[PDB]
Symmetry: C2
Subunit: 515 residues, 2 copies
């Protein structure tokens, strides 16, 4: 006779009763209290259901940040449906791929800034374009607009018994290979994530969070959109980051938190200097020194532990930053320890647990593990093999029990019989105090496929030779993993997106012979 666990719908139904006059969401001139939000969600759900959307059905969002993203997630959630929050910077080929892959019943799109890509993509789909398209930033009466579609639904709550293990949020992720896959996050995934984040950040109903991170990425949901929603705080939306509008919203909405990277913080600070505008309610998590005393430094566990400075490990498929230095105290390893909804093992290629200090694939079980990728039957079977989710990230356990994240398992060398993970070698070299960064590649060898080569970037105030790098590796890693040679560079090549460009390293330094 026992009932379901809590769903995202239950959260809104509770907030509308417990917090009748509190502001849930702000987006430009739109201000919605909990009951006004839940009413809109019910009307939206009514219209979605009238259009044939039910359990397991799919809605794709192709816009920037909006309060409507939260409405759509809640409304789909009340029907047991799911929303993909798409990457609004997709070019037409990638947008077409995602539309065909996800196969949505409904697409909610944005005109501003992306109408050209959208038009190109619909042209490409041709006779396969059978979804309903609704323009979110339309005139309010536009019959092909979101608001008109929503207004046509009734106030009644659908009141269905939705299983919270159902996917509700789908976020596309890219492998190093460039292959993209939609990670299925359930109600339970999001609630467990949000509950842990509320402990990490000391979040409560007085939190006012600026949704200045992209909602197509897990970061903004974890820190701090979903915990703010869960604890009945106020979510303030900005479409994307424009420093002046951000500053204005921080002040006008009295924000306590925001998702801001250091270059944005510096921009905000420069334009606020000697204006007298009060940013002191903002709890500075990232780059506290950059704020020049204008914000208050965060004293939550998130900041105190170093997690805010990157001391942790996670991925979309673990509902975000699931391992951190805020769990379990001081840590020799760079990532800390798993939080409450997760257990982690480091597994070798044979699926056996690695010894302390031995590098292997980070694998996980627990409430924060995603439900799999959408439409990836073979990949899912492989990646959930033996009842563990395989992250494709390489790590090790330290003697104190903490974890170190080394890099990906998807780069591998094979030198004669020996599999070698460059990430392990890179991390070893990067411990040398003269080294700022190191990239490891494989170069062809006619007798045993590949030799190991390191491309090393020194700190400006340091010097070290090829031989000294090689000897540094001797006591730390297996002999066959050491670089045969070392090239020095001023900096590594990087992609337009800021990631390491291994194709470029391979082209420059004679890389080849990979498995």
């Amino acid at each position: 006779n026992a009932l379901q666990h809590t769903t995202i719908g239950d959260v809104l139904r509770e907030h509308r009763r417990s917090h009748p006059g509190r502001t849930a969401l702000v987006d430009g001139p739109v201000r919605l209290t909990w009951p006004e939000l839940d009413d809109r969600v019910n009307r939206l759900a009514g219209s979605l259901a009238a259009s044939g959307i039910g359990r397991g059905d799919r809605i794709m969002w192709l816009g920037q940040n909006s309060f409507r993203v939260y409405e759509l997630i809640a409304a789909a959630g009340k029907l047991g449906a799911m929303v993909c929050v798409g990457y609004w910077r997709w070019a037409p080929p990638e947008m077409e791929f995602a539309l065909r892959d996800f196969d949505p019943h409904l697409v909610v799109w944005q005109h501003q800034e992306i109408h050209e890509t959208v038009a190109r993509t619909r042209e490409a789909l041709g006779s396969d374009d059978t979804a309903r398209w609704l323009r979110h930033d339309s005139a309010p009466q536009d019959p092909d607009g979101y608001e008109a579609f929503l207004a046509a639904g009734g106030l009644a709550d659908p009141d269905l018994d939705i299983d919270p293990d159902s996917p509700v949020l789908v976020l596309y992720t890219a492998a190093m290979s460039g292959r993209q896959c939609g990670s299925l996050l359930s109600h339970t995934n999001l609630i467990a994530m949000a509950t842990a984040a509320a402990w990490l950040g000391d979040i409560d109903h007085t939190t006012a969070f600026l949704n200045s991170g992209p909602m197509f990425h897990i970061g903004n949901h974890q820190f701090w959109g979903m915990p703010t929603l869960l604890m009945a705080g106020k979510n303030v939306i900005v479409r994307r980051v424009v420093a002046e509008e951000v500053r204005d919203l921080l002040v006008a909405e009295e924000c306590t938190h925001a998702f801001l990277m250091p270059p944005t913080v510096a921009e905000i600070v420069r334009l606020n200097r000697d204006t007298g505008h009060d940013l002191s309610r903002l709890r500075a998590t990232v780059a506290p020194h950059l704020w020049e005393g204008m914000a208050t430094t965060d004293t939550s566990r998130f900041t105190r532990s170093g997690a805010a400075a990157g001391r942790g490990y996670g991925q979309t498929e673990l509902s975000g930053f699931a391992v951190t230095a805020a769990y379990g105290g001081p840590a020799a390893g760079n990532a800390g320890r798993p939080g409450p909804g997760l257990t982690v093992r480091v597994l070798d290629t044979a699926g056996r647990e690695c010894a302390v200090g031995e590098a292997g694939e980070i694998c996980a079980r627990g409430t924060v593990v995603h439900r799999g990728y959408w439409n990836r039957d073979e990949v899912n079977a492989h990646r959930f093999r033996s009842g563990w989710w395989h992250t494709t990230d390489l790590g090790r356990r330290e003697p104190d029990g903490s974890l170190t994240f080394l890099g990906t398992t998807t780069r591998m060398l094979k030198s004669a019989a020996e599999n070698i993970f460059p990430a392990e070698v890179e991390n070893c070299i990067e411990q040398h105090p003269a080294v700022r960064e190191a990239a490891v590649i494989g170069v062809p060898n006619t007798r045993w496929a590949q030799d190991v080569k390191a491309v090393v970037v020194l700190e400006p105030d340091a010097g070290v030779s090829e031989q000294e790098i090689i000897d540094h590796c001797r006591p730390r890693i297996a002999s066959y993993k050491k670089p045969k040679s070392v090239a020095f560079a001023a900096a590594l090549p990087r992609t337009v997106s800021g990631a390491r460009d291994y194709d470029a390293l391979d082209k420059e330094y004679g890389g080849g012979g990979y498995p």
Copy 2:
């Protein structure tokens, strides 16, 4: 392909890897680190499985507090079995009832203080006594002892795929009628409860909790045994409360928390005064003023909100104190608002939602709701009707959205066509500033079954008449709910257990004619 949620077994498996040298449990001379505890749990699980215990099977604990209670819960949990932590003060009739009801495969019992009751109870069971009995506080080699049974198991983890919705902890509760029923708490119930409690109390791996509350009751598990376990802190066991031993453990184990009622606090303080023993690490939640500066006042949300002083509502069946003033800010209602794993509605007799201010039965859905009572098919069907758990507690929602707990729904008057809940009338009278407490009973009326009568206890420094009590009620409650007469008393009659004695009020004041 997606996996299970987190189980209690996963918690111990993670802690043994992440916290290899930290102390998990202390009980007299026993000190167990996380790996030593998980090893014992694996040996215990091996022996339990060898004896035929598997999914859905049942172990009854008839002892006082022990580290072995945590071991048994974990070991049963790894098999998908459940442990009833019995009321060690049961007299033989109640002990026999519980044994026959719960029908355990194994009974782990305690000689000290209760051997006579146990012997009487086994005599009564006669030829129906077919369970294995293991003495927990035996000589270590006793072949009918717990330690010998455990030592015979192997170190291998059973490594089963246990559904965490499975009951793992069973706690007996008593209705006002005196009927006793075992509430089924799942792994998920306990973990969700523990996660919320860790936010409430700011619990982490440095917490050191003294298990000085009874483990047969939900209080000690919620505040703070289970969150301490979840966050990898140290649980220190005391068999029962003896002020001097408690004081010694608080100091020697450097406890940060304990489950202590005010009379016990005052006893500890009296015996610590001018000894110089340092109690300053203890975070005083209850009765902070009674500590005379010897402990540090708790600054967590639990204390700051008033929850620690009783501003909240819960029951075993909601995994404890599930509604509190720490959730959602200031509250007009005495109980506050529901925490994250719960939604609450106040429902009238017809199952429709009550208006703001109208008294009705507190009903719940969500992750913290129990799985039902053991062996109560008809009661469970009735109490989970319409997909809500019915608490049998009477409450109302206030205009600000908070909740007030009024009393039980199991006391009811029926005066002609009108159902009247005395708890509603009592709460109304108790708002009068002259009134310390009020009890309401029904007295026979030959024309319409019952009239309402109030028994009122005044504050010592106040005076108020019968008529003034009646007129106080006029604008606050329906006319037919007002007392027809008021008797004044120096204090209410109470049972040996400290609860109100309505049988005694009925006998003294002419009560009768109940539905």
